[PDB]
From Swiss-Prot, chains A, B:
Record field: pH dependence: Optimum pH is 7.0-9.0.
One Pfam short name: PTE
Modified residues (N6-carboxylysine): K137
InterPro entries cross-referenced by the UniProt entry: AryldialkylPase_Zn-BS, Metal_Hydrolase, Phosphotriesterase
Keywords from the UniProt entry: Cobalt, Hydrolase, Iron, Metal-binding
Protein source organism: Saccharolobus solfataricus (strain ATCC 35092 / DSM 1617 / JCM 11322 / P2)
Gene3D superfamilies: Metal-dependent hydrolases
Temperature note: Thermostable.
Catalytic activity: An aryl dialkyl phosphate + H2O = dialkyl phosphate + an aryl alcohol
Keyword DNA damage: no
Protein name: Aryldialkylphosphatase
Listed cofactors: Co(2+); Fe cation
Regulation: Inactivated by EDTA and o-phenanthroline.
Length: 296, 296
Protein backbone atom coordinates (compact mmCIF):
# COMPACT_ATOMS: atom_id res chain seq x y z
CA UNK A 1 0.00 0.00 0.00
CA UNK A 2 1.66 3.21 -1.17
CA UNK A 3 0.42 4.32 -4.62
CA UNK A 4 -3.36 4.80 -4.89
CA UNK A 5 -5.02 3.14 -7.88
CA UNK A 6 -8.33 4.00 -9.48
CA UNK A 7 -10.92 1.35 -8.62
CA UNK A 8 -8.45 -0.83 -6.72
CA UNK A 9 -6.60 -1.12 -3.43
CA UNK A 10 -3.35 0.81 -3.24
CA UNK A 11 -0.11 -0.95 -4.24
CA UNK A 12 3.47 -0.83 -3.03
CA UNK A 13 5.64 1.21 -5.40
CA UNK A 14 7.91 -1.85 -5.78
CA UNK A 15 5.00 -3.68 -7.44
CA UNK A 16 4.19 -1.07 -10.13
CA UNK A 17 5.88 -3.13 -12.84
CA UNK A 18 6.23 -1.94 -16.41
CA UNK A 19 4.73 1.56 -16.33
CA UNK A 20 3.67 4.16 -18.87
CA UNK A 21 4.28 7.36 -16.90
CA UNK A 22 2.33 9.93 -19.00
CA UNK A 23 -0.72 8.81 -21.01
CA UNK A 24 -4.17 10.40 -21.25
CA UNK A 25 -7.23 8.18 -21.43
CA UNK A 26 -9.13 11.27 -22.58
CA UNK A 27 -8.56 15.01 -22.64
CA UNK A 28 -10.98 17.91 -23.12
CA UNK A 29 -11.80 21.43 -22.00
CA UNK A 30 -14.29 21.26 -19.12
CA UNK A 31 -16.03 24.49 -20.08
CA UNK A 32 -16.60 23.70 -23.69
CA UNK A 33 -17.82 20.16 -22.93
CA UNK A 34 -20.25 21.51 -20.34
CA UNK A 35 -21.52 24.19 -22.70
CA UNK A 36 -21.56 22.31 -26.05
CA UNK A 37 -21.98 18.60 -25.28
CA UNK A 38 -23.04 17.99 -28.89
CA UNK A 39 -19.32 18.15 -29.80
CA UNK A 40 -18.46 15.04 -27.76
CA UNK A 41 -19.14 11.31 -27.77
CA UNK A 42 -18.34 9.64 -24.44
CA UNK A 43 -19.11 6.21 -25.86
CA UNK A 44 -16.46 6.60 -28.57
CA UNK A 45 -14.04 8.02 -25.99
CA UNK A 46 -14.66 5.03 -23.73
CA UNK A 47 -14.23 2.47 -26.51
CA UNK A 48 -10.99 4.15 -27.66
CA UNK A 49 -9.59 4.29 -24.14
CA UNK A 50 -10.39 0.65 -23.41
CA UNK A 51 -8.91 -0.47 -26.74
CA UNK A 52 -5.72 1.50 -26.16
CA UNK A 53 -5.32 0.21 -22.59
CA UNK A 54 -5.92 -3.36 -23.77
CA UNK A 55 -3.26 -2.95 -26.45
CA UNK A 56 -0.77 -1.60 -23.90
CA UNK A 57 -1.50 -4.60 -21.67
CA UNK A 58 -0.79 -6.94 -24.59
CA UNK A 59 2.73 -5.46 -24.73
CA UNK A 60 3.31 -6.03 -21.01
CA UNK A 61 2.21 -2.74 -19.48
CA UNK A 62 1.11 -3.20 -15.87
CA UNK A 63 0.51 0.39 -14.73
CA UNK A 64 -0.52 3.56 -16.55
CA UNK A 65 -0.14 7.02 -15.02
CA UNK A 66 -2.75 9.43 -16.39
CA UNK A 67 -1.86 13.09 -15.67
CA UNK A 68 -5.19 14.57 -16.77
CA UNK A 69 -6.11 17.29 -14.26
CA UNK A 70 -8.07 20.56 -14.06
CA UNK A 71 -8.05 22.18 -17.49
CA UNK A 72 -7.85 18.88 -19.34
CA UNK A 73 -11.07 17.20 -18.20
CA UNK A 74 -10.12 14.75 -15.43
CA UNK A 75 -13.11 12.49 -14.72
CA UNK A 76 -12.51 9.85 -12.07
CA UNK A 77 -15.75 8.01 -12.87
CA UNK A 78 -14.75 7.59 -16.52
CA UNK A 79 -11.35 6.36 -15.35
CA UNK A 80 -12.91 3.80 -13.02
CA UNK A 81 -15.13 2.52 -15.85
CA UNK A 82 -11.98 1.97 -17.95
CA UNK A 83 -10.36 0.11 -15.03
CA UNK A 84 -13.43 -2.10 -14.64
CA UNK A 85 -13.28 -2.94 -18.37
CA UNK A 86 -9.55 -3.74 -18.50
CA UNK A 87 -8.09 -4.48 -15.06
CA UNK A 88 -5.20 -2.02 -15.60
CA UNK A 89 -3.47 -0.37 -12.65
CA UNK A 90 -4.31 3.32 -13.21
CA UNK A 91 -2.73 6.16 -11.23
CA UNK A 92 -4.80 9.35 -11.23
CA UNK A 93 -3.41 12.72 -10.20
CA UNK A 94 -4.41 16.17 -9.08
CA UNK A 95 -3.20 19.57 -10.21
CA UNK A 96 -3.96 22.48 -12.49
CA UNK A 97 -2.96 22.75 -16.14
CA UNK A 98 -2.72 26.42 -17.13
CA UNK A 99 -0.38 28.44 -19.33
CA UNK A 100 -1.34 32.01 -18.37
CA UNK A 101 -4.05 32.74 -15.78
CA UNK A 102 -6.13 30.76 -13.29
CA UNK A 103 -9.94 30.51 -13.52
CA UNK A 104 -11.87 33.37 -11.94
CA UNK A 105 -12.54 31.18 -8.90
CA UNK A 106 -8.96 31.82 -7.76
CA UNK A 107 -9.21 35.60 -7.64
CA UNK A 108 -8.04 36.70 -4.18
CA UNK A 109 -7.15 33.12 -3.18
CA UNK A 110 -3.82 32.08 -1.68
CA UNK A 111 -1.22 29.52 -2.71
CA UNK A 112 -2.19 27.60 0.45
CA UNK A 113 -5.82 27.45 -0.72
CA UNK A 114 -4.68 25.99 -4.03
CA UNK A 115 -2.47 23.42 -2.30
CA UNK A 116 -5.44 22.47 -0.09
CA UNK A 117 -7.32 21.38 -3.23
CA UNK A 118 -4.43 19.10 -4.20
CA UNK A 119 -4.11 17.73 -0.66
CA UNK A 120 -7.87 17.10 -0.61
CA UNK A 121 -7.57 14.88 -3.67
CA UNK A 122 -4.51 13.06 -2.30
CA UNK A 123 -5.81 12.48 1.24
CA UNK A 124 -9.62 12.42 0.95
CA UNK A 125 -10.43 11.46 -2.64
CA UNK A 126 -11.17 12.76 -6.14
CA UNK A 127 -14.55 14.24 -7.15
CA UNK A 128 -16.49 12.77 -4.22
CA UNK A 129 -15.08 9.24 -4.61
CA UNK A 130 -12.58 7.37 -2.49
CA UNK A 131 -10.10 7.20 -5.40
CA UNK A 132 -7.08 9.22 -4.33
CA UNK A 133 -4.51 11.17 -6.30
CA UNK A 134 -1.01 9.74 -6.48
CA UNK A 135 0.92 12.72 -7.92
CA UNK A 136 0.53 16.41 -8.81
CA UNK A 137 0.59 17.71 -12.39
CA UNK A 138 1.52 21.31 -13.31
CA UNK A 139 2.31 23.16 -16.56
CA UNK A 140 4.02 26.11 -18.18
CA UNK A 141 4.51 26.81 -21.86
CA UNK A 142 5.26 29.62 -24.32
CA UNK A 143 4.02 32.42 -21.97
CA UNK A 144 6.65 31.37 -19.42
CA UNK A 145 6.37 31.53 -15.63
CA UNK A 146 3.49 33.93 -15.14
CA UNK A 147 2.24 34.96 -11.70
CA UNK A 148 -0.54 32.34 -11.74
CA UNK A 149 1.70 29.63 -13.22
CA UNK A 150 4.13 30.23 -10.34
CA UNK A 151 1.30 30.07 -7.78
CA UNK A 152 0.42 26.61 -9.04
CA UNK A 153 4.06 25.47 -8.95
CA UNK A 154 4.41 26.66 -5.36
CA UNK A 155 1.15 24.93 -4.38
CA UNK A 156 2.44 21.66 -5.89
CA UNK A 157 5.54 21.96 -3.70
CA UNK A 158 3.36 22.35 -0.60
CA UNK A 159 1.35 19.28 -1.57
CA UNK A 160 4.51 17.25 -2.13
CA UNK A 161 6.00 18.27 1.21
CA UNK A 162 2.80 17.28 3.03
CA UNK A 163 2.00 14.02 1.19
CA UNK A 164 5.29 12.95 -0.48
CA UNK A 165 3.59 12.34 -3.85
CA UNK A 166 5.74 13.21 -6.90
CA UNK A 167 5.25 16.04 -9.37
CA UNK A 168 4.90 15.72 -13.14
CA UNK A 169 5.25 18.81 -15.28
CA UNK A 170 4.40 19.95 -18.75
CA UNK A 171 7.01 22.35 -20.12
CA UNK A 172 7.89 23.95 -23.43
CA UNK A 173 11.13 22.41 -24.67
CA UNK A 174 12.13 25.55 -26.62
CA UNK A 175 12.25 27.86 -23.61
CA UNK A 176 13.50 27.50 -20.04
CA UNK A 177 10.17 26.68 -18.40
CA UNK A 178 11.27 23.16 -17.43
CA UNK A 179 14.47 24.43 -15.82
CA UNK A 180 12.45 27.11 -14.02
CA UNK A 181 9.87 24.61 -12.76
CA UNK A 182 12.66 22.41 -11.39
CA UNK A 183 14.38 25.41 -9.79
CA UNK A 184 11.26 26.77 -8.10
CA UNK A 185 10.20 23.35 -6.79
CA UNK A 186 13.63 22.45 -5.43
CA UNK A 187 14.02 25.91 -3.86
CA UNK A 188 10.74 25.21 -2.05
CA UNK A 189 12.12 21.94 -0.68
CA UNK A 190 11.01 19.31 -3.21
CA UNK A 191 13.46 16.45 -3.70
CA UNK A 192 14.69 16.73 -7.32
CA UNK A 193 14.14 13.00 -7.81
CA UNK A 194 10.45 13.56 -7.05
CA UNK A 195 10.06 15.70 -10.21
CA UNK A 196 9.53 14.68 -13.84
CA UNK A 197 10.13 17.64 -16.18
CA UNK A 198 7.99 16.77 -19.16
CA UNK A 199 8.09 17.33 -22.91
CA UNK A 200 11.87 17.53 -23.09
CA UNK A 201 11.88 15.09 -26.01
CA UNK A 202 10.47 17.97 -28.06
CA UNK A 203 13.94 19.52 -28.43
CA UNK A 204 17.30 18.30 -29.70
CA UNK A 205 19.21 20.67 -27.40
CA UNK A 206 20.81 17.77 -25.54
CA UNK A 207 22.75 20.09 -23.21
CA UNK A 208 19.52 21.59 -21.88
CA UNK A 209 18.00 18.14 -21.28
CA UNK A 210 21.18 16.92 -19.59
CA UNK A 211 21.26 20.03 -17.39
CA UNK A 212 17.84 19.15 -15.94
CA UNK A 213 18.75 15.49 -15.44
CA UNK A 214 22.08 16.45 -13.87
CA UNK A 215 20.17 18.56 -11.34
CA UNK A 216 18.44 15.35 -10.18
CA UNK A 217 15.06 15.21 -11.95
CA UNK A 218 13.57 12.80 -14.46
CA UNK A 219 13.40 14.00 -18.06
CA UNK A 220 10.26 13.28 -20.01
CA UNK A 221 11.06 12.01 -23.48
CA UNK A 222 7.33 11.86 -23.84
CA UNK A 223 5.03 12.82 -26.75
CA UNK A 224 6.30 9.89 -28.85
CA UNK A 225 10.15 16.64 -33.39
CA UNK A 226 10.16 13.55 -35.62
CA UNK A 227 10.35 10.23 -33.82
CA UNK A 228 13.57 9.53 -35.73
CA UNK A 229 15.05 12.70 -34.25
CA UNK A 230 13.40 11.94 -30.90
CA UNK A 231 14.78 8.39 -31.12
CA UNK A 232 18.17 9.86 -32.00
CA UNK A 233 18.04 12.13 -28.95
CA UNK A 234 16.74 9.27 -26.81
CA UNK A 235 19.49 6.99 -28.15
CA UNK A 236 22.11 9.72 -27.65
CA UNK A 237 20.98 10.24 -24.06
CA UNK A 238 21.12 6.48 -23.48
CA UNK A 239 24.53 6.24 -25.16
CA UNK A 240 25.67 9.09 -22.89
CA UNK A 241 24.50 7.30 -19.74
CA UNK A 242 21.23 9.08 -18.91
CA UNK A 243 18.98 5.96 -18.86
CA UNK A 244 18.29 6.33 -15.13
CA UNK A 245 16.73 9.78 -15.67
CA UNK A 246 14.80 9.05 -18.87
CA UNK A 247 11.05 8.55 -18.85
CA UNK A 248 9.41 7.59 -22.16
CA UNK A 249 5.77 8.11 -22.84
CA UNK A 250 3.59 8.83 -25.81
CA UNK A 251 1.62 11.58 -24.13
CA UNK A 252 -1.03 9.85 -26.23
CA UNK A 253 -4.62 11.02 -25.84
CA UNK A 254 -6.96 8.17 -26.75
CA UNK A 255 -9.35 11.05 -27.50
CA UNK A 256 -8.55 14.77 -27.52
CA UNK A 257 -10.90 17.60 -28.49
CA UNK A 258 -8.31 20.02 -29.95
CA UNK A 259 -8.81 21.25 -33.50
CA UNK A 260 -0.33 7.61 -33.28
CA UNK A 261 -1.17 5.29 -30.39
CA UNK A 262 -0.25 4.25 -26.87
CA UNK A 263 1.85 1.41 -28.33
CA UNK A 264 4.01 3.42 -30.72
CA UNK A 265 6.96 2.97 -28.39
CA UNK A 266 6.46 -0.77 -28.78
CA UNK A 267 6.07 -0.62 -32.57
CA UNK A 268 8.68 2.07 -33.26
CA UNK A 269 10.68 3.58 -30.40
CA UNK A 270 11.68 0.44 -28.48
CA UNK A 271 12.40 -1.54 -31.70
CA UNK A 272 14.51 1.35 -33.02
CA UNK A 273 16.46 1.47 -29.75
CA UNK A 274 16.99 -2.30 -29.77
CA UNK A 275 18.11 -2.21 -33.42
CA UNK A 276 20.72 0.38 -32.43
CA UNK A 277 22.28 -1.73 -29.67
CA UNK A 278 20.19 -0.74 -26.63
CA UNK A 279 19.76 -3.83 -24.48
CA UNK A 280 17.01 -5.16 -22.22
CA UNK A 281 18.27 -3.70 -18.94
CA UNK A 282 18.00 -0.18 -20.39
CA UNK A 283 14.37 -0.74 -21.37
CA UNK A 284 13.72 -2.10 -17.88
CA UNK A 285 15.47 0.87 -16.27
CA UNK A 286 13.36 3.38 -18.16
CA UNK A 287 10.00 1.62 -17.78
CA UNK A 288 10.28 -0.17 -14.40
CA UNK A 289 13.16 1.13 -12.28
CA UNK A 290 12.64 4.85 -12.94
CA UNK A 291 8.89 4.82 -12.12
CA UNK A 292 9.55 2.73 -9.00
CA UNK A 293 12.00 5.36 -7.72
CA UNK A 294 9.73 8.23 -8.78
CA UNK A 295 6.89 6.82 -6.68
CA UNK A 296 9.12 5.48 -3.88
CA UNK B 1 -43.20 34.40 -30.42
CA UNK B 2 -39.84 36.14 -30.79
CA UNK B 3 -37.72 35.90 -27.61
CA UNK B 4 -37.07 32.34 -26.38
CA UNK B 5 -37.72 31.73 -22.69
CA UNK B 6 -36.32 28.98 -20.50
CA UNK B 7 -39.02 26.41 -19.74
CA UNK B 8 -41.74 28.35 -21.57
CA UNK B 9 -43.05 29.17 -25.02
CA UNK B 10 -41.37 32.11 -26.72
CA UNK B 11 -42.85 35.59 -26.26
CA UNK B 12 -43.21 38.64 -28.45
CA UNK B 13 -40.63 41.29 -27.54
CA UNK B 14 -43.50 43.75 -26.97
CA UNK B 15 -44.67 41.57 -24.06
CA UNK B 16 -41.36 41.42 -22.14
CA UNK B 17 -42.58 43.95 -19.57
CA UNK B 18 -40.39 45.25 -16.77
CA UNK B 19 -37.03 43.59 -17.42
CA UNK B 20 -33.76 43.16 -15.56
CA UNK B 21 -31.30 42.99 -18.47
CA UNK B 22 -28.17 41.59 -16.74
CA UNK B 23 -28.55 39.32 -13.68
CA UNK B 24 -26.85 36.00 -12.89
CA UNK B 25 -28.82 33.27 -11.18
CA UNK B 26 -25.47 31.61 -10.47
CA UNK B 27 -21.90 31.94 -11.68
CA UNK B 28 -18.92 29.61 -11.37
CA UNK B 29 -15.86 28.29 -13.17
CA UNK B 30 -16.80 25.08 -15.01
CA UNK B 31 -13.38 23.51 -14.56
CA UNK B 32 -13.04 24.06 -10.88
CA UNK B 33 -16.61 22.89 -10.17
CA UNK B 34 -16.01 19.73 -12.21
CA UNK B 35 -12.72 19.05 -10.46
CA UNK B 36 -13.52 20.10 -6.86
CA UNK B 37 -17.27 19.70 -6.35
CA UNK B 38 -16.75 19.77 -2.58
CA UNK B 39 -16.45 23.58 -2.90
CA UNK B 40 -20.04 23.99 -4.10
CA UNK B 41 -23.58 23.57 -2.80
CA UNK B 42 -26.19 23.46 -5.57
CA UNK B 43 -29.02 23.34 -3.05
CA UNK B 44 -27.93 26.64 -1.49
CA UNK B 45 -27.41 28.11 -4.97
CA UNK B 46 -30.92 27.04 -5.97
CA UNK B 47 -32.55 28.41 -2.82
CA UNK B 48 -30.71 31.74 -3.22
CA UNK B 49 -31.66 32.04 -6.88
CA UNK B 50 -35.33 31.27 -6.25
CA UNK B 51 -35.46 33.72 -3.33
CA UNK B 52 -33.85 36.49 -5.37
CA UNK B 53 -36.14 35.90 -8.36
CA UNK B 54 -39.19 35.89 -6.07
CA UNK B 55 -38.09 39.19 -4.54
CA UNK B 56 -37.63 40.74 -7.99
CA UNK B 57 -41.13 39.57 -8.93
CA UNK B 58 -42.52 41.24 -5.80
CA UNK B 59 -41.18 44.55 -7.15
CA UNK B 60 -42.84 44.05 -10.53
CA UNK B 61 -40.12 42.36 -12.56
CA UNK B 62 -41.59 40.28 -15.39
CA UNK B 63 -38.49 39.16 -17.29
CA UNK B 64 -34.89 38.53 -16.25
CA UNK B 65 -32.06 38.24 -18.77
CA UNK B 66 -29.26 36.00 -17.46
CA UNK B 67 -26.01 36.43 -19.44
CA UNK B 68 -24.17 33.48 -17.88
CA UNK B 69 -22.29 31.70 -20.69
CA UNK B 70 -19.16 29.59 -21.24
CA UNK B 71 -16.60 30.51 -18.61
CA UNK B 72 -19.21 31.43 -16.02
CA UNK B 73 -21.05 28.13 -15.61
CA UNK B 74 -24.23 28.37 -17.69
CA UNK B 75 -26.51 25.44 -16.80
CA UNK B 76 -29.83 25.40 -18.61
CA UNK B 77 -31.25 22.65 -16.39
CA UNK B 78 -30.61 24.69 -13.24
CA UNK B 79 -32.23 27.67 -14.96
CA UNK B 80 -35.32 25.66 -15.87
CA UNK B 81 -35.63 24.44 -12.26
CA UNK B 82 -35.64 28.09 -11.12
CA UNK B 83 -38.32 28.89 -13.71
CA UNK B 84 -40.45 25.98 -12.51
CA UNK B 85 -40.15 27.26 -8.92
CA UNK B 86 -41.00 30.91 -9.67
CA UNK B 87 -42.77 31.35 -13.02
CA UNK B 88 -40.35 34.11 -14.10
CA UNK B 89 -39.70 34.81 -17.78
CA UNK B 90 -35.99 33.95 -18.10
CA UNK B 91 -33.91 34.71 -21.20
CA UNK B 92 -30.80 32.55 -21.52
CA UNK B 93 -27.94 33.37 -23.85
CA UNK B 94 -24.94 31.89 -25.58
CA UNK B 95 -21.40 33.17 -25.90
CA UNK B 96 -17.93 32.93 -24.45
CA UNK B 97 -16.62 34.94 -21.51
CA UNK B 98 -12.82 35.24 -21.75
CA UNK B 99 -10.32 38.00 -21.03
CA UNK B 100 -7.16 36.59 -22.66
CA UNK B 101 -7.15 33.20 -24.43
CA UNK B 102 -9.71 30.60 -25.50
CA UNK B 103 -9.77 27.05 -24.08
CA UNK B 104 -7.44 24.58 -25.79
CA UNK B 105 -10.41 23.18 -27.72
CA UNK B 106 -10.25 26.23 -30.00
CA UNK B 107 -6.66 25.73 -31.14
CA UNK B 108 -6.68 25.78 -34.95
CA UNK B 109 -10.42 26.55 -35.08
CA UNK B 110 -11.96 29.34 -37.13
CA UNK B 111 -14.18 32.27 -36.21
CA UNK B 112 -16.92 30.54 -38.23
CA UNK B 113 -16.60 27.43 -36.06
CA UNK B 114 -17.05 29.58 -32.96
CA UNK B 115 -20.09 31.33 -34.44
CA UNK B 116 -21.55 27.90 -35.29
CA UNK B 117 -21.61 27.09 -31.56
CA UNK B 118 -23.59 30.26 -30.86
CA UNK B 119 -25.95 29.62 -33.78
CA UNK B 120 -26.45 26.05 -32.53
CA UNK B 121 -27.67 27.36 -29.18
CA UNK B 122 -29.91 29.99 -30.81
CA UNK B 123 -31.48 27.75 -33.47
CA UNK B 124 -31.33 24.21 -32.07
CA UNK B 125 -31.15 24.54 -28.28
CA UNK B 126 -28.85 24.77 -25.25
CA UNK B 127 -27.03 21.75 -23.77
CA UNK B 128 -29.25 19.14 -25.42
CA UNK B 129 -32.54 20.80 -24.47
CA UNK B 130 -35.04 22.68 -26.58
CA UNK B 131 -34.42 25.91 -24.62
CA UNK B 132 -32.90 28.36 -27.08
CA UNK B 133 -30.53 31.27 -26.62
CA UNK B 134 -31.95 34.75 -27.07
CA UNK B 135 -28.74 36.84 -27.21
CA UNK B 136 -24.94 36.51 -27.36
CA UNK B 137 -22.64 37.53 -24.50
CA UNK B 138 -18.96 38.47 -24.99
CA UNK B 139 -16.26 40.07 -22.81
CA UNK B 140 -13.03 42.00 -22.70
CA UNK B 141 -11.28 43.50 -19.70
CA UNK B 142 -7.89 44.77 -18.51
CA UNK B 143 -5.87 42.73 -21.09
CA UNK B 144 -7.71 44.56 -23.89
CA UNK B 145 -8.67 43.18 -27.29
CA UNK B 146 -6.44 40.14 -27.59
CA UNK B 147 -6.44 37.89 -30.65
CA UNK B 148 -8.83 35.40 -29.02
CA UNK B 149 -11.06 38.13 -27.55
CA UNK B 150 -11.41 39.57 -31.07
CA UNK B 151 -12.24 36.13 -32.51
CA UNK B 152 -15.13 35.86 -30.09
CA UNK B 153 -16.37 39.38 -30.92
CA UNK B 154 -16.30 38.59 -34.63
CA UNK B 155 -18.15 35.30 -34.05
CA UNK B 156 -20.86 37.17 -32.12
CA UNK B 157 -21.32 39.47 -35.11
CA UNK B 158 -21.80 36.46 -37.40
CA UNK B 159 -24.38 35.00 -35.02
CA UNK B 160 -26.25 38.31 -34.85
CA UNK B 161 -26.31 38.70 -38.63
CA UNK B 162 -27.70 35.16 -39.05
CA UNK B 163 -30.23 35.13 -36.19
CA UNK B 164 -30.87 38.83 -35.33
CA UNK B 165 -30.39 38.23 -31.59
CA UNK B 166 -28.73 41.11 -29.70
CA UNK B 167 -25.28 41.20 -28.14
CA UNK B 168 -24.46 41.98 -24.51
CA UNK B 169 -20.88 42.76 -23.57
CA UNK B 170 -18.74 42.89 -20.50
CA UNK B 171 -16.13 45.64 -20.73
CA UNK B 172 -13.65 47.35 -18.44
CA UNK B 173 -14.85 50.90 -17.82
CA UNK B 174 -11.31 52.23 -17.27
CA UNK B 175 -10.00 51.34 -20.71
CA UNK B 176 -11.44 51.52 -24.22
CA UNK B 177 -12.61 47.90 -24.49
CA UNK B 178 -16.29 48.88 -24.66
CA UNK B 179 -15.66 51.38 -27.45
CA UNK B 180 -13.56 48.77 -29.27
CA UNK B 181 -16.24 46.09 -28.93
CA UNK B 182 -18.83 48.48 -30.36
CA UNK B 183 -16.50 49.48 -33.20
CA UNK B 184 -15.60 45.93 -34.21
CA UNK B 185 -19.22 44.74 -34.08
CA UNK B 186 -20.59 47.67 -36.08
CA UNK B 187 -17.77 47.38 -38.63
CA UNK B 188 -18.86 43.76 -39.10
CA UNK B 189 -22.44 44.87 -39.80
CA UNK B 190 -24.16 44.70 -36.40
CA UNK B 191 -26.83 47.36 -35.84
CA UNK B 192 -25.52 49.58 -33.00
CA UNK B 193 -28.92 49.41 -31.30
CA UNK B 194 -28.50 45.63 -31.06
CA UNK B 195 -25.51 46.05 -28.70
CA UNK B 196 -25.39 46.67 -24.94
CA UNK B 197 -21.89 47.75 -23.86
CA UNK B 198 -21.77 46.63 -20.26
CA UNK B 199 -20.13 47.78 -17.04
CA UNK B 200 -20.01 51.43 -18.05
CA UNK B 201 -21.47 52.44 -14.69
CA UNK B 202 -18.07 51.52 -13.25
CA UNK B 203 -16.59 54.85 -14.39
CA UNK B 204 -17.48 58.50 -13.87
CA UNK B 205 -15.96 59.51 -17.22
CA UNK B 206 -19.33 60.67 -18.55
CA UNK B 207 -17.86 61.71 -21.91
CA UNK B 208 -16.73 58.14 -22.61
CA UNK B 209 -20.15 56.72 -21.69
CA UNK B 210 -21.91 59.33 -23.81
CA UNK B 211 -19.60 58.58 -26.75
CA UNK B 212 -20.76 54.95 -26.80
CA UNK B 213 -24.43 55.89 -26.45
CA UNK B 214 -24.08 58.56 -29.15
CA UNK B 215 -22.77 55.86 -31.50
CA UNK B 216 -26.12 54.07 -31.11
CA UNK B 217 -25.62 51.37 -28.45
CA UNK B 218 -27.13 50.81 -25.03
CA UNK B 219 -24.91 51.64 -22.06
CA UNK B 220 -24.93 49.25 -19.14
CA UNK B 221 -25.13 51.10 -15.85
CA UNK B 222 -25.06 47.65 -14.37
CA UNK B 223 -23.21 46.25 -11.33
CA UNK B 224 -25.41 48.25 -8.93
CA UNK B 225 -17.75 52.85 -7.92
CA UNK B 226 -20.04 53.69 -4.99
CA UNK B 227 -23.75 53.55 -5.71
CA UNK B 228 -23.95 57.22 -4.72
CA UNK B 229 -21.41 58.01 -7.43
CA UNK B 230 -23.08 55.51 -9.77
CA UNK B 231 -26.44 57.09 -8.94
CA UNK B 232 -24.88 60.51 -9.58
CA UNK B 233 -23.62 59.35 -12.97
CA UNK B 234 -26.94 57.66 -13.71
CA UNK B 235 -28.81 60.81 -12.64
CA UNK B 236 -26.43 63.00 -14.66
CA UNK B 237 -26.96 60.85 -17.75
CA UNK B 238 -30.73 61.03 -17.22
CA UNK B 239 -30.56 64.79 -16.62
CA UNK B 240 -28.55 65.05 -19.86
CA UNK B 241 -31.15 63.12 -21.85
CA UNK B 242 -29.60 59.65 -22.16
CA UNK B 243 -32.52 57.67 -20.63
CA UNK B 244 -33.25 55.90 -23.92
CA UNK B 245 -29.76 54.37 -23.98
CA UNK B 246 -29.44 53.50 -20.29
CA UNK B 247 -29.81 49.95 -19.05
CA UNK B 248 -29.69 49.41 -15.28
CA UNK B 249 -28.88 46.10 -13.73
CA UNK B 250 -27.24 44.84 -10.59
CA UNK B 251 -25.05 42.30 -12.34
CA UNK B 252 -26.00 40.49 -9.13
CA UNK B 253 -24.89 36.88 -8.77
CA UNK B 254 -27.27 35.08 -6.42
CA UNK B 255 -24.22 32.85 -5.87
CA UNK B 256 -20.69 33.39 -7.18
CA UNK B 257 -17.63 31.27 -6.42
CA UNK B 258 -14.96 34.03 -6.56
CA UNK B 259 -12.72 34.51 -3.55
CA UNK B 260 -26.08 43.35 -2.28
CA UNK B 261 -29.12 41.84 -3.98
CA UNK B 262 -31.18 41.76 -7.15
CA UNK B 263 -33.53 44.35 -5.61
CA UNK B 264 -30.96 47.00 -4.67
CA UNK B 265 -32.18 49.16 -7.53
CA UNK B 266 -35.61 49.02 -5.94
CA UNK B 267 -34.34 49.74 -2.42
CA UNK B 268 -31.65 52.27 -3.35
CA UNK B 269 -31.12 53.26 -6.98
CA UNK B 270 -34.71 53.84 -8.11
CA UNK B 271 -35.68 55.58 -4.82
CA UNK B 272 -32.59 57.81 -5.08
CA UNK B 273 -33.51 58.71 -8.67
CA UNK B 274 -37.11 59.44 -7.71
CA UNK B 275 -35.98 61.57 -4.75
CA UNK B 276 -33.89 63.63 -7.18
CA UNK B 277 -36.77 64.43 -9.53
CA UNK B 278 -36.65 61.50 -11.97
CA UNK B 279 -40.23 60.64 -12.89
CA UNK B 280 -42.09 57.43 -13.75
CA UNK B 281 -41.70 57.59 -17.53
CA UNK B 282 -37.91 57.55 -17.16
CA UNK B 283 -38.03 54.41 -15.02
CA UNK B 284 -40.34 52.85 -17.61
CA UNK B 285 -38.04 53.87 -20.46
CA UNK B 286 -35.02 52.25 -18.85
CA UNK B 287 -36.71 49.04 -17.69
CA UNK B 288 -39.43 48.43 -20.32
CA UNK B 289 -38.90 50.48 -23.49
CA UNK B 290 -35.14 49.96 -23.81
CA UNK B 291 -35.29 46.14 -23.44
CA UNK B 292 -38.23 45.99 -25.86
CA UNK B 293 -36.17 47.80 -28.52
CA UNK B 294 -33.05 45.76 -27.73
CA UNK B 295 -34.93 42.53 -28.38
CA UNK B 296 -37.11 43.92 -31.19
CO1 LIG C 1 1.91 18.18 -21.31
CO1 LIG D 1 -19.60 41.37 -16.91
FE1 LIG E 1 0.05 15.17 -21.27
FE1 LIG F 1 -22.43 39.76 -15.52
Amino acid sequence: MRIPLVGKDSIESKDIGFTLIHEHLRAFSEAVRQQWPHLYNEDEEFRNAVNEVKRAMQFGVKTIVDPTVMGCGRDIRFMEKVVKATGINLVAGTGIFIFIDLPFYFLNRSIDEIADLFIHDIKEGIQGTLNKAGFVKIAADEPGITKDVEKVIRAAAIANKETKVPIITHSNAHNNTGLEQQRILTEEGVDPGKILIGHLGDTDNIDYIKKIADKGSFIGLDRYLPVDKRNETTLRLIKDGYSDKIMISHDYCCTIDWGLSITLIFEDTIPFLKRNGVNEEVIATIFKENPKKFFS
